[model samples]
Target chain A: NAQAEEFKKYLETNGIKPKQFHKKELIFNQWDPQEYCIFLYDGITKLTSISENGTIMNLQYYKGAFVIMSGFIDTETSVGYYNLEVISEQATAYVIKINELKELLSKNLTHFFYVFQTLQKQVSYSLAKFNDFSINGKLGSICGQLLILTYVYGKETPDGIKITLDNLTMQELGYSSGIAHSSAVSRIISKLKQEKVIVYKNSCFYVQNLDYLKRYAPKLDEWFYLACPATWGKLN
Target chain B: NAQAEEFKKYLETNGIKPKQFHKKELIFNQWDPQEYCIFLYDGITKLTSISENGTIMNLQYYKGAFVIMSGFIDTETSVGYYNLEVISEQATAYVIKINELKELLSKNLTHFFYVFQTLQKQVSYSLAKFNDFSINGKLGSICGQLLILTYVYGKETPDGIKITLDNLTMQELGYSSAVSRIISKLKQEKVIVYKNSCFYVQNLDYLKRYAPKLDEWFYLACPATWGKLN
Candidate 1:
């Protein structure tokens, strides 16, 4: 309650509460949002560009976290085009019409700064994903995905932070890093389970012992610094 | 001169001309910017944010394009107190204090859209370079470096655009990609030459053709140019 309350306040201060929806299909071609900002506040949201042939490819996805929430602002364009779709059970968002948001920024540069920070966050994510999908190897890839998911959905526990694998597909859990079968989450998870590096209960992953996880993730340990540089030197 | 003159007007409309300096060092520590936007134009400028340390890591380099100029706006706060310095012989810039730019954005969203476009260009470059530097390995890195140099300063020639290797030393040419030995034999292979005090490339086709087949040695040797080397 406390966590969600703080996050809701965060959305109101920096953004606004919009209606909830099961999926993003409702808004795809319903209206043109010339002056609107829509952001995902909870659960998973995916940015996909639909092809004319009805093929939808995931351009990006965000599992919204505490500090940052990721979702597209407006899409008054095409249906067989770039679109943002929420994939969770029920997803809430922080919304502000572009005029309202513009008005907000006009009053204080702080709102504009928030917009910049959000864009900066997008840049950081793009760069990080670019690095992962390009350079890193298998274990490194797996570690990157795990770290991101942990960041996105993990919560504090007595033992350590736990991440539930709800709302994820086998396709994603397999190659979440956007590369095919380098870390191959299947083998990695098997190894992790056998090594007792992670506690798995109800299809959720928990970091029982920090050192233990790192010990098994040797390749990841070496590659993690280069993989996720934002956390570099800051994490113990 | 006409292009630079037009560019000056472009900056005035979209930005303001700040005092110019050869190196970013002059303006970095001169003041703490609550709002500042600095941009480089018309030359190869290496963007290095100098921290409090002796540590000066190269972030990226920009040969400002006509449509999109690469520059860092106000970062507001710092992870490390640092400054930017220009590496080329001479560089010119269009600068605007952040407050002024913010005021412009406030006046009209058109200026803000331009900022967004500029930042989008930065994003593309960052993604591309991050891929090249980190993933593409030796040949890719070497080709990337060559392509950028050619793109930055290459000029008129019958065979192709020729770029003079004036400021660049062998150490840099040898391994700008951080690979040790790929471009070492550039002169020997007639891939590059010293004539009329400059190096020439017959065309863009060379790097494309040879980029894939060459391995680590791509760093030491480039493919022979189609036209006469000298």
Candidate 2:
């Protein structure tokens, strides 16, 4: 939840008003890095892909996220081109010009610190999964990816943890792990369900065993700084 | 390169006078964050380990680098306490306090931007290798690690792009790729050579052939735009 502060105050102060959009409106048009960064006060956006013929592909789903375009972002291949559609009935976001964001960051140290911490969080989160993927095979990476998504989207529940990925498609889960085809993702998800590591009753995935996840991908805890704070926190 | 500008201004403005160290003086003493961040004015500091019995372990080597005393540095486990020894015959560094660095960053947009770009550079470079490692296997990860080291330390010669791990031992290269057993890291060097005026990795392309995804994370361009540019 602390990751919420990832958005710099400058973005909130100088950005455009919170505009609501329909379910399938193009939220990230063309994704020209110089254009603008969309902020999520709340609502769900899918990194969707719609074929010219009308077939839809969901690569990933995000909520309470920030998309400031620009990087040699090669791993996600064509990540910038991925469509952002409002998956919820209605979605709202604040848009700020890229240059304007830079202007505010340049003068504001607190704003700059926000960016710094945000990247570090990403570095930890990404590498946790990356390291897991690197250490084991596809299954291991998938476990890592799910664990991370769990941490990202999971909320505290009375029993254990509840993660409702309303549209948890295979394609989306596949990309989340690094490199796995849709069928591979489909199989992995099936296997995960079969093994009872996760329970997908209807649309939501209820994690049956959180500790099992840790054994599968302990790096997630380390990278996220949940397991050992002293490893990454300031030495005082 | 442009990155050099990151260090000069900070050093002259707020650091203690440059001090020289011998072959093994602790550059980053006791891993103290409150203490001054070390500036690599000149020298290669090896992140080495000499066991209690003194069988030296070379984890990784660094030179022409800046160690700013703060950040949410996650990936490198046990990173804070890693040993850094002056490997070059003579090394000079400016020790500047953390509070002083923070003060500068607070007031100076230039300093803040420098740090911002530095992290971006690290993200690209580290992730590039990381991605390559993930796509390929351990051997692939090893090559990715080597290539990144090459980018950091490689100098172009007319004949080839030469990267000399002057003190490269099995332990170091192994750890560089996240391997533990030093002898296993020994196997990788046969594809390499053992000479003083070293030519271990013949070319950047050589590393790429082993793992092509290396190309993705290899770029060194910092993030575009400073404070304000019309």
Candidate 3:
């Protein structure tokens, strides 16, 4: 936790005053490089690259405890300047100055580099496992379970981390997961809800019994083993 | 130059023998964690990553240069591995121990850090430009131009000196910009031909000319400018 605090202080010292924002606010507008680096304090943020025909592909999504918009190191390209839309309505983040990152990188290069390397290993391992599980497990089921696991075991804040699923309607879920918007995500969610695997309370889905939820989804365990290798084995 | 001979001697002293290979040999497979670094003596080598679907995305291409592939030091995920594919039929390379690199990075952390930073900057700038150009320019055209430009202007020798490239095909280029590769790269080639003092044959098809807006593309250029200004 001190590492997180130190990281925060490091950002602050570099003139990056982190701010928390409610979901649905534009983190950074398209083609504007003003908002450079975004640290996900809580919730999730979706980065979409809009095509000329208005077809949107979610290039990436950053959840709690991840850094976003690292592509900003390239000042010449529009990729860093693309629009960043908050997928979560109650998404919380820290907006920091992009220029100060170089100083921060220099001051804490080893630590920051270690953190980045760890994050990459975890994400890559998780993606690889997810790919394997998708071969047998339903894609929708896997996505829902991943969402629950990310909500429950993903991050824990002082006052419980906020994960708003309001934006995740059936169609949105399908699109987010690269399935057809008319596909079976809604049906799978309804089935899981009947089994009481998760609860939709107060218009927000709360993972009531993560253990019960994980039993039906063993890939979630595999993801944990892959993402947090320290819990399993030394990654190196 | 002296750098190539020095690197050659350094390798010999370390016990790793120099190896020669023809073009089309896979020096390092994509995503394969590099066990050792490479020094190019003659010919060209390309660094590429292969996707799950077998799509090869060229990260960087080196000719007559020194290429070190130490395990992940900065980034968290090591999904991508450095692939050293020989592009020249008569390419020579010297493999250096990773321990040697560790010592270098430790003794000259600042210099090593700056080199890594510069490489990262170039990568980031290329990614950004690739995204922007993808909007207007086709991927093939962009990649072609980048490969050509790399052949013409990319400098790989690490002797505190740099050189320019006119044109060379993928096969004629060396694996790394080692001192040997730099000298061999500068030599006049009879086979696979160089016309009009350029490395490549089809100049127009292989080149992309773009007027980059200064402010938009300034980050990659800033470090060098800062060095001069300071």
Compare the candidates by lDDT and give the number of the best one.
Answer: 2
Per-residue error for A111 in candidate 3, Å, reads: 3.1
**Deviation in Å, model 3, residue B193 alpha carbon:** 18
What local lDDT does model 1 show for residue A199?
67
Docking class of 1: incorrect
Residue A57 of model 3, lDDT score: 45
Model 1 TM-score on chain A? 0.61
- Per-candidate DockQ values are 0.08, 0.13, 0.11
Q: Which stretch of 10 consecutive residues in model 1 chain B shows the poorest summed lDDT?
A: B213-222
lDDT rank, highest first? 2, 3, 1
Clash count of each predicted structure? 13, 3, 35
Chain B TM-score for candidate 1: 0.64
Q: Roughly what TM-score does model 3 have, to 2 decimal places?
A: 0.50
lDDT of 2 by residue, A1-236 (tens): 34445453445556545778866676775444444546665767765433334555454455655443333222112223345677666677776665565676666655555556555455445445554554555767767766666666566565446675545333334433445457876887677767777664454556777666666675655554542354324211
Off by over 4 Å in 1: A1-116, A124-148, A164-202, A208-236, B1-17, B23-35, B41-43, B49-56, B64-75, B78-83, B94-100, B128-138, B169-197, B206-230
- A187-232 in candidate 3: lDDT tens per residue? 7656666765555445544454445444554444444453454532
TM-score-based ranking, best first? Answer: 2, 1, 3
Candidate 2 residue pairs that clash: B36-B96, B58-B172, B128-B217
* Candidate 1 residue lDDT tens string, B69-112: 21123344322222445555556666656555556555644445
- Winner on lDDT between 2 and 3 is 2
Best by TM-score: 2
